[PDB]
């Protein structure tokens, strides 16, 4: 009996820290962004 | 002067919201791409699973009746 | 022997490419908004 | 003219930032969806694998020990 | 006047944009982890499974071997 | 055989992030500039 073999199953991961660590870091520098008459 | 410094803090903002997003769409893109990935590989499982379960189940009704003829 | 079914296990897929589109578009649209003087 | 020019440079922009976040709830409630659905089938398959890996481990005992009976 | 009230809008909607920006990161942040925690179960899922699969194998390679040694 | 009950797959609740998500999308309204 050979059973199929599924070790090639594969579920990928993400790495989307860049764009967290960006969104996070132009929600902080806007503040430079403000209007000041 | 003051129209100036408008102008100038409106080309900076705008500049900052261009990159956020950016960054929001690679980020939406990757997280629908790995997403997608693992539904195939879960889709994928399901399949190959329900074919060794198949095949499971044929060798134990086989195995079954063999027992059953020698007993 | 019966063992149970699994088939009508599936996973959907999600399609946000418009979204996507919308906002790289979005992101390149802004520069018809910036001020010049 | 230049406030006229801030002023509706100004409303552009805020409408294209509205569509823009429109946009980013819209894929966000999508991969929300799209996630917990794929968490749903992970459970649900991990739940039926269980019970099957209980049938067959039940169905080899028995095949196991009414080997033993026979020699 | 008008100066002011172009200075105060955009710094309300920029104060609304930051909230949104925060918004989308704490959302993207929560959607990568569960989507890698869900990863990390199916490859777990995935290994324990061929490892069972590898379990059911030998077994019935065994009582198969044991039927022909019977009959 | 192997245990594997333990697998669990968690899921996200991200409804708070939409949610102020479209409220600002609604509220930026209240921003645009009339001379």
Known sequence: VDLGDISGINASVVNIQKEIDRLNEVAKNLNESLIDL | ?71
């Open chain 2, 1 to 71: 002067e003051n129209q100036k410094l408008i102008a100038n803090q409106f080309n900076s903002a705008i500049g900052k919201i261009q990159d956020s997003l950016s960054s929001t769409a690679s980020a939406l893109g990757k997280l629908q791409d790995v997403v997608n990935q693992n539904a195939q590989a879960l889709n994928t499982l399901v399949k190959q699973l329900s074919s060794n379960f198949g095949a499971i189940s044929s060798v134990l009704n086989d195995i079954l009746s063999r027992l059953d003829k020698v007993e």
